[PDB]
């Protein structure tokens, strides 16, 4: 069974993770560096799957293969605590998250039924340069670990983790970064999700949020109302000409945190250049024509399960927000207005970076979900949420 709390985690033994090069849940980490040395020789054979299943690297350039992956995740990926909502990553979003610069086809690691060819399992790695305290290391980011519901509790997920580890080792990479809503050995940081209602009537009707006993629907509407247009002078969508300055602003801004990406200019283009219904980035171009700030948020809707009328929830997720001349509070206020303008029902943000400076003021409510951050094969002290400067998808 999975552990969502540190209390429930302390009472668990981790048959798989105890075999892995990560610190134990109990210990305090006093050192910096790899848990074990880099391997001089790597297993050449893929790990064995239960009888009747086979590995298959997924070419996401094939529209039908991408749609199979969409469907696996849409029906079997992450749900909320009460099994009411499930992530519904779009096919085009998956292309964005899984084909950044340097992506490798063998790192899109699928499991198929031999007879029917049904896709029943998945895990992915993408390369990323990660700055962790005083070290910069080429790592991978692991995402989208998914096992079909009919296939769970058959230790397929440990096989998926070992197989992607093997395939990453073959490329000479020995560390990874990843998040999870469960506690595992051993988080480098724990972040909390906060939620800012944008369409509170829909959120309440579908039981995403609850009307407090001391608040009417009418007061809830007024509490969350926003302006019709943003207030910041010179706010506009990011364009191709802004890629260098956005790269520069981000690089300088991230230096104050202890876990951050190190992005090339091409990676900045990939992660921030606006794509409708995937990623939005707005820059502030001032009266001199100079770009001084930017905000970004990605699009991640969810399925509303077993509901007759409302089928989906449109969520915006705070990505990276850089301020040098505009107050962060004004920047995020305009992000809320832009998300509302674009039809989003809720705006989500973690308590990492400097987000705690605006969460309560802009009327975010604290969520029931922690997002733990992990490093594989790297020992270092844990850090508070406000020093985590890394957002995944």
């Amino acid at each position: 069974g999975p552990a969502k709390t540190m209390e429930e985690a302390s009472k668990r033994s981790y048959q798989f993770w105890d075999t892995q090069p990560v610190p134990k849940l109990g210990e305090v980490v006093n050192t910096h560096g790899p848990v074990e040395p880099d391997k001089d020789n790597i297993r050449q054979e893929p790990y064995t799957l239960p009888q009747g299943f086979t590995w298959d690297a997924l070419d996401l350039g094939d529209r039908g293969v991408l749609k199979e992956l969409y469907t696996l995740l849409n029906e079997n990926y992450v749900e909320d605590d009460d099994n009411m909502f499930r992530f519904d990553y779009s096919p085009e979003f998956l292309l964005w998250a899984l084909r950044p610069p340097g992506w490798l086809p063998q790192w899109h690691c699928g499991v198929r039924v031999v007879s029917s060819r049904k896709l029943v399992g998945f895990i992915s790695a993408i390369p990323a340069n990660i700055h962790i305290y005083d070290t910069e290391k080429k790592m991978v980011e692991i995402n989208f670990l998914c096992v079909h519901k009919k296939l769970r509790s058959k230790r397929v997920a440990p096989v998926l983790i070992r197989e992607i580890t093997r395939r990453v080792h073959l490329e000479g990479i020995f560390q990874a970064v990843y998040t999870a809503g469960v506690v595992l050995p051993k988080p480098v940081g724990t972040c909390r999700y906060w939620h800012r209602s944008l369409n509170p009537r829909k959120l309440i009707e579908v039981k995403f949020s609850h009307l407090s006993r001391n608040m009417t629907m009418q007061r809830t509407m007024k509490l969350y109302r926003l302006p019709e247009t943003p207030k910041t002078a010179g706010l506009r969508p990011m364009e191709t000409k802004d890629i260098p300055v956005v790269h520069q602003l981000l690089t300088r801004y991230l230096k104050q945190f202890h876990l951050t990406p190190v992005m090339s200019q091409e990676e900045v283009e990939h992660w921030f250049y606006p794509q409708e219904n995937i990623i939005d980035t707005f820059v502030v171009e001032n009266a001199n024509g100079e770009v001084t700030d930017f905000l970004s948020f990605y699009t991640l809707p969810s399925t509303i399960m077993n509901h007759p009328t409302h089928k989906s929830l449109k969520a915006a997720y705070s990505f990276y927000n850089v301020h040098t001349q505009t107050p962060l509070l004004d920047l995020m206020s305009d992000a809320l207005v832009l998300a509302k303008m674009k039809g989003f029902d809720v705006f989500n943000a973690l308590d990492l970076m400097e987000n705690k400076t605006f969460l309560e003021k802009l009327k975010f409510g604290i969520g029931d979900g922690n997002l733990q951050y992990y490093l594989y094969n790297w020992k270092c002290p844990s850090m508070g949420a406000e020093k985590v400067g890394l957002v995944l998808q």
């Binding site: 992450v78 499930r86 809503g181």
Partner: peptide
């Protein structure tokens, strides 16, 4: 992976 949160 990510985690699905909702208001406490």
């Amino acid at each position: 992976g990510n985690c699905f949160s909702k208001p406490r």
